[PDB]
Amino acid sequence: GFDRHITIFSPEGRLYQVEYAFKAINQGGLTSVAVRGKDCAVIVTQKKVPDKLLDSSTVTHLFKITENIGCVMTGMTADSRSQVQRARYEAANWKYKYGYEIPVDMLCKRIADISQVYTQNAEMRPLGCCMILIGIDEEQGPQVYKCDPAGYYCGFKATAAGVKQTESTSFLEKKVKKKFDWTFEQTVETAITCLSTVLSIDFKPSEIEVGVVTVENPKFRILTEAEIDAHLVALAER
Amino acid sequence: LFQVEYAQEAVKKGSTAVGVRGRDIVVLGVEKKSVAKLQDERTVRKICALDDNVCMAFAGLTADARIVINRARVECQSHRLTVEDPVTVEYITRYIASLKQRYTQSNGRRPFGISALIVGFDFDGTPRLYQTDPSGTYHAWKANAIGRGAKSVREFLEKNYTDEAIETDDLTIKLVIKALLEVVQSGGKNIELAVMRRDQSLKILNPEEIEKYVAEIEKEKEENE
Amino acid sequence: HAGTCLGILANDGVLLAAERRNIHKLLDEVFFSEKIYKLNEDMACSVAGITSDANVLTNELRLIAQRYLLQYQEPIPCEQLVTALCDIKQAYTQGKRPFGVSLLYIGWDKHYGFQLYQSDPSGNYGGWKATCIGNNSAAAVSMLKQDYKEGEMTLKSALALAIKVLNKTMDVSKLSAEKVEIATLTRENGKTVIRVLKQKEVEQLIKKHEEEEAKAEREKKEKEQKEK
Amino acid sequence: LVLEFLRPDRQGVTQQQFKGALYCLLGNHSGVCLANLHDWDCIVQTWPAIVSSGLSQAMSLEKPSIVRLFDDLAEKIHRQYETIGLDFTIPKSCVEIAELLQQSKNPSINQILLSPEKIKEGIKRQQEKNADALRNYENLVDTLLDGVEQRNLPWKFEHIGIGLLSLLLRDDRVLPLRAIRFFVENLNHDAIVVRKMAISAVAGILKQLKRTHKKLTINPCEISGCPKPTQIIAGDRPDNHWLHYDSKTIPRTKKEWESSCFVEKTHWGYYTWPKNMVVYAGVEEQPKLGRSREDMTEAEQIIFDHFSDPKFVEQLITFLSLEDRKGKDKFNPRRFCLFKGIFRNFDDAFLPVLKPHLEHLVADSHESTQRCVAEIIAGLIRGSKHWTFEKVEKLWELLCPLLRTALSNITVETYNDWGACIATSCESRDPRKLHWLFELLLESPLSGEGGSFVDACRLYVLQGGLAQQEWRVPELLHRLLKYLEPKLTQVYKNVRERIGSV
Amino acid sequence: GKLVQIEYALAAVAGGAPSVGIKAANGVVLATEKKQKSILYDERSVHKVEPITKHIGLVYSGMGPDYRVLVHRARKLAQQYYLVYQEPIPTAQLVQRVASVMQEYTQSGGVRPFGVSLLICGWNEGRPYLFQSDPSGAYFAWKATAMGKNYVNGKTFLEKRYNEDLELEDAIHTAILTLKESFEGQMTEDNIEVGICNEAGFRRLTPTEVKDYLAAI
Ligand SMILES: O=P(O)(O)O[C@H]1[C@@H](OP(=O)(O)O)[C@@H](OP(=O)(O)O)[C@@H](OP(=O)(O)O)[C@@H](OP(=O)(O)O)[C@H]1OP(=O)(O)O
């Protein structure tokens, strides 16, 4: 009653609208996984298409904010595209002002500031999308950063966003409890294994979209169906 | 319209004030309410001179009265600037009334909450008396009252106001005293008088100055019996 | 009513008495020492409110005074300064966020001499020979109306009166110089002197009040005995 | 044990333990007060300890929590206090019923009958119990006095102790002498809070001191001499005629004043007469007046001496005249009941001492003076009822100028107070007894010498008095209507309104 | 009532993680728990402690995004002052302005108040300083406080353990004790964030020295 209908404090001090946005992210109905390695970072997520007519190519939840930065979005698609657009804008503005490519942490920070503005202001509903970012930082090497609608942003050795993020995170915690310093193939296998386990799907290569960054090749890249199938078949014979 | 009713009740609560119009004189009287044991009576005026040729008495909320008075003073000066002539009492009345129907910056109590008596001498020299309302309606009067008990005073003014009463300027002053005396039972220092005295600036009466006038009517009251 | 302030007019001067109090032991109290805020050389104020509200109100006031000084190169009159603040606090009333504090103002103006003013939260203001604000303002004004003589005040008598009414009103339960803040406005050599009372002078005044209370206690016990 | 923590003499306790003990004493909003236990043994332990905790040295009154705790203790005690014991004597019938109740043998075990020695032991125990209770009452009173005046105490604790003493007003027994002296001494005290508290206390005391007035029995049919038939119709009747006010029937002499009934209550006689009537027997039967100052025991004596003190009367009068608030002031019926109790108990003792003060007060044009003198004037008038004819004659000779000047000087600030004064003076009194007030007030309400608003306020206080005299003044209402009828067409608005009300 | 939102914001603050401040003679400490929801969360990435200026740093208990907003504003304000006056901002002045913005936001309609309380520390004029700026806009000056969970418990523990004169090391210790009371357990360099203000300037204690201080207990 006027506390849940707008972004204002509950008696216990809680932002129900923000909780509802976190619910909306799961209402979107897709899962994303991110994991970090000594030499690389990767993203995996399912891109199951309901309609045959709908083009598989155009639909993807992986985007390029900059050449060296790749992101994945979950939740409401329109909000995801808007967030992606704003991230692109901020990155270019950063480059223009400061003469060097924005680091992933600063980008996540800016985006979280923007989400903060919506949660603070009543007129705007919180943007119901969650962004995970991968990039290579020269000082710290690969990095993974994740910004919620609320504005909390934190670095992650590995993480998940989606309907099964909880079980995914349990799996990732079990995996990283052992040190398991992962090379590129190991990170890829780890990510796909997390998703295949948590969704119980046993993906075909077309089902999933994969993007990575490497210290050798900082350029963000989207793996093609064939390389994805190579990784999956190497996994299956294991 | 709803704020207007609250404003009208507020001015109804306020201190009584009257004004009279005379041929070479206009008089303005307001009862001086007791303040406290320890307060200083200086700050409270209930009378203001918008210009040399205009005087005002308000009834109602003091702060809103302050705002109105300041705005009207600055308007009086700006009109003098643009027109090079003394402001007309009708004009400044029209502005103060017009100021009521802008509003507060938030529009809260769009009527500011005072009905005030504006009295002055025209540039041609003709005396004028007016009042304003929170509503914004403004009228002219031979004489009037505002504040608590004004209605009873208007009955007294209705009969007492006459060519004979106004024939003498000092009598023009004394009539105001009697009007207040009906309104206020203090019969003394609880009163404030101001007179324009055509072609000269407003001169507030001294406490002794009012005192002798009070004595004179008190004697004349004695003389009738 | 977190705080209390007090003010008295004298023929030769004016003083502000405020209860320097610590809600909690951990509070440093070096920062909160300055209950008295100097608006300018010729004025001061004491606030019945939190330090933040006080800082903002005081800044508005100081800005106003310095603007008047910039225009005219004369120090501002107390009435005009208080009136500007009152007009602002009123305009907030007309926002829906009226100023929630009442202030004392003390100053010397050549036009009116020594003066003491009080500002209501509604924006209305009034001149007082002596008054208190904040906690137990009602008891304070009662004792002042009892113990104050119009025109008979001198700075010394007024100061002792302040100590007395503070002892009755404020909840210190024992006067300490650390626990009370006193400041006086005086005119010396044609210049306005705002001086906080030193801890030693405050201790001396406290001791005078204490011995006077003892001497009074002796008299009442004697008279009570004599009655029976 | 819980009182041990906040004991003053004890040291090393702590601020925290002190606060915890205060919370224990405060208790929850609902349940055992833990400081207002009905037990006499518990209260004597608690209340002195609460007041004595001021000088504990483990108490930081600067603590807002601490001061709010003490205020909460005070408010909770004041609201939840009930009268405490002092007598537990069962009457003879109830023990008979109990004797039957033991005898009933159907759901009963055959316990041996209570022996006479046991019954003697029981009454012995009960007598010792109520005596110990009275002892505890007196001890608590003395102890709280010692607490409120030990010279190391803060003012808040002093105020609290004075309130607690205010609670101990007893109505079975007079208060202890030292306490009565303390309260009457506090009438002139610097703190307004303490002053009002003392006022209410001493008015209660004056009711305690009040000597019972003998009341004779009359037959209303006989005194009237009318037939008084059955199936009587309410209202004015032949039998109620003596009760009805009349100009000819005013006594105007000592003999007639002695002869007059002076029922002093309006409501008797409209509808039907009671079975037994009470009419305040002759002055000889009543308690003596004009006491020598030797007669009074000790409690009346101290009040008498303080009020005889002119410095005391002057200081008290000046304190009453002092304004508490501007525009929010009222009649203060407690101050009124005090002054009535004074004049009633001591029978015109101190009107000579007060007369300078009254003559000064009515002269002053300030509102608060008029308020105080009005309370005093009406308290005096109400006390006057049991006074003899000569005493009241002198009193009204005193009062008439004071009232004339007061009404002439009524104003906007004072009109409500003076109307309250006139109504309270008029209330619960025979009209013939108060004929002076009516003849004065009705002399010229619509004088017009003062002007309008004062003619109105005169009519207003008049209407108040006549309202108090319901159905006992058909005459004087006819007179008001006759005086009023010409002036209907020569009148202003405020007067017209009050004219309609009257 | 707008005040209701202020009360709810204070409750939201009280829900926040513990933050502790102690004012030594020669230095001020600021400490807080930064307990990580999971091992996956990387502690090094984000610091609850952050410096406004070289000589000033602060810590928060409450909503992190609100804290990021306020620290950005404070940094800009201090730099504004430094441009004007070419001297470092005083701690009280900064606290006042930060209170100004908090008060501005809550006063403004259509926007909620900040859900955080800040503890602001600095060293200037050869002196230590400590302040707490609440959501209402009120600022107070303390020798020591705690915020967040069990803040009253921390405050009384501080009251019993405090001394008017103490060294920076002893104040570091008593801060860490205070947090050790509230903390769930297994306190370590990663789980706890520390900063000190002194003549040297504000600095966030590195994990190595924080491990040294923890080992001292
Ligand atoms: O019969 P009592 O209990 O002794 O009290 C009556 C009576 O009181 P009751 O109506 O309760 O009998 C009167 O009327 P109240 O005002 O008390 O209702 C009167 O008071 P007034 O003088 O104000 O009329 C006065 O009561 P008190 O003694 O409390 O003043 C009087 O008592 P006495 O009969 O003892 O004179």
Q: How far apart are CA B12 and CA D207, in angstroms?
A: 45
What are residue C107's DSSP bridge partners?
Answer: C43, C115
> Which atom of ligand 1 is closest in space to residue D382's alpha carbon?
22
Residue of C nearest to B36 (CA): C128
C52: its two tokens: 């933040």
Q: Subunits touching B (CB < 8 Å, at least 3 pairs)?
A: C, D
The DSSP code sequence of E46-87 is: --S-EESSSSEEEEEEE-HHHHHHHHHHHHHHHHHHHHHHSS
Q: Which fold has domain B1-224?
A: Glutamine Phosphoribosylpyrophosphate, subunit 1, domain 1 (3.60.20)
The DSSP code for D239 is G
B220: its two tokens: 């004349």
Chain C residues with CB under 8 Å of B108 CB are: 93-94, 96
Q: How far apart are CA E25 and CA E171, in angstroms?
A: 9
The secondary structure element, H or E, covering residue D29 is none
- Does the CA dihedral E201-E202-E204-E209 come out positive or negative? positive
CA distances from B50 to A194, B67, B140, C124, E46 (A): 83, 12, 18, 21, 64
B40: its two tokens: 């200083």
From atom 24 of ligand 1, which residue's Cα is the shortest distance away?
A: D428
CATH, domain range C1-218: 3.60.20.10
Q: How far apart are CA D249 and CA D474, in angstroms?
A: 14
- When computed from its CA atoms, the radius of gyration of chain D, rounded to whole angstroms, is 28
Q: Subunits touching A (CB < 8 Å, at least 3 pairs)?
A: E
Task: Give the strands of the sheet with E19-23, arranged side by side.
Answer: E144-147, E19-23, E28-33, E192-197, E203-204
Q: Does the CB atom of residue D265 touch ligand 1 within 6 A?
A: no
Q: Does the CB atom of residue D215 touch ligand 1 within 6 A?
A: no
Q: Could you tell me if A85 and E76 are in contact, meaning their C-beta atoms sit under 8 angstroms apart?
A: no
Residue at E65: amino acid letter:
P
Breaks (C-N over 2.5 A) in chain C follow: 94
Contact between chains at E14 and A13 (C-beta distance less than 8 A): yes
Q: How far apart are CA D165 and CA D176, in angstroms?
A: 11
> Which atom of ligand 1 is closest in space to residue D212's alpha carbon?
35
Q: How far apart are CA D164 and CA D46, in angstroms?
A: 11
E and B touch with 3+ CB pairs <8 Å, answer no
Q: How far apart are CA C2 and CA C7, in angstroms?
A: 18
Residues, chain C: 228
CA distances from B84 to D83, D109, D486 (A): 83, 115, 59
D412: its two tokens: 């906007």
Structural domain range at position E168: 1-217
Chain E residues with CB under 8 Å of A152 CB are: 64-65
Contact between chains at C167 and D322 (C-beta distance less than 8 A): no
Q: Exposed/middle/buried for C72, CB within 10 Å: 0-12, 13-18, 19+?
A: exposed
Q: Does D492 touch chain B (CB under 8 A)?
A: yes
Q: Could you tell me if A127 and A79 are in contact, meaning their C-beta atoms sit under 8 angstroms apart?
A: yes
> Cβ–Cβ contacts within 10 Å for residue E41, how many?
18
Q: Could you tell me if D221 and D273 are in contact, meaning their C-beta atoms sit under 8 angstroms apart?
A: yes
Q: What are phi and psi of D106, to 5 degrees?
A: -75, -65
3-state DSSP of D418-452 = HHHHHHHHHCCCCCHHHHHHHHHHCCCCCCCCCCC
C38: its two tokens: 């100097």
Q: What are phi and psi of B85, to 5 degrees?
A: -125, 160
Q: Is D117 helix (H, G, I), strand (E, B) or coil?
A: helix
Structure-token match 């090393």, residue found: D12
Chain D residues with CB under 8 Å of C118 CB are: none
The DSSP code for E44 is G
3-state helix, strand and coil shares in percent for chain B, rounded to the nearest 5: 40, 20, 35
Resolution (A): 3.2
Q: Which of B153, B71, B55, B53 shows the shortest CA–CA distance to B112? A: B71
Q: How far apart are CA A126 and CA A19, in angstroms?
A: 10
C180: its two tokens: 């009370």
The DSSP code for D414 is T
Q: CA D31 from chain center: how many Å?
A: 32
> Which atom of ligand 1 is closest in space to residue D213's alpha carbon?
35
Q: CA E39 from chain center: how many Å?
A: 25
Residue of A nearest to E111 (CA): A121
Chain B residues with CB under 8 Å of C93 CB are: 63, 108
Q: Is E122 helix (H, G, I), strand (E, B) or coil?
A: strand
Q: Is D216 helix (H, G, I), strand (E, B) or coil?
A: coil
Q: How far apart are CA D471 and CA D431, in angstroms?
A: 11
- Maximum C-alpha span of chain A: 57
Residue of C nearest to D181 (CA): C224
B23: its two tokens: 């041929």
The residue to mutate among D428, D429, D433, D434, having the most atoms of ligand 1 within 8 angstroms of its beta carbon, is D428
Q: Enumerate the domain spans of chain A.
A: 1-238
Contact between chains at D451 and B182 (C-beta distance less than 8 A): yes
The DSSP code sequence of B108-149 is: TTSS-SEEEEEEEE-SS--EEEEEE-SSS-EEE-SEEEESTT
Residues with Cβ within 8 Å of A191's Cβ and at least 6 positions away in sequence, in order, are A33, A34, A35, A42, A43, A44, A210
Q: How far apart are CA D280 and CA D290, in angstroms?
A: 19
CA distances from B129 to B29, B207, C181 (A): 13, 25, 53
Q: Could you tell me if C119 and C48 are in contact, meaning their C-beta atoms sit under 8 angstroms apart?
A: no
Residues with Cβ within 8 Å of D127's Cβ and at least 6 positions away in sequence, in order, are none
What are residue D422's DSSP bridge partners?
Answer: none
B and A touch with 3+ CB pairs <8 Å, answer no
Q: Does the CB atom of residue D213 touch ligand 1 within 6 A?
A: yes
Structure-token match 């969650």, residue found: A130
Q: How far apart are CA D56 and CA D8, in angstroms?
A: 4
3-state helix, strand and coil shares in percent for chain E, rounded to the nearest 5: 40, 25, 35
Q: Could you tell me if C132 and C16 are in contact, meaning their C-beta atoms sit under 8 angstroms apart?
A: no
Q: How far apart are CA D199 and CA D334, in angstroms?
A: 7
Q: What are phi and psi of C194, to 5 degrees?
A: -105, 115
Q: Does the CB atom of residue D435 touch ligand 1 within 6 A?
A: no
B135: its two tokens: 């509503």
Q: How far apart are CA C41 and CA C193, in angstroms?
A: 8
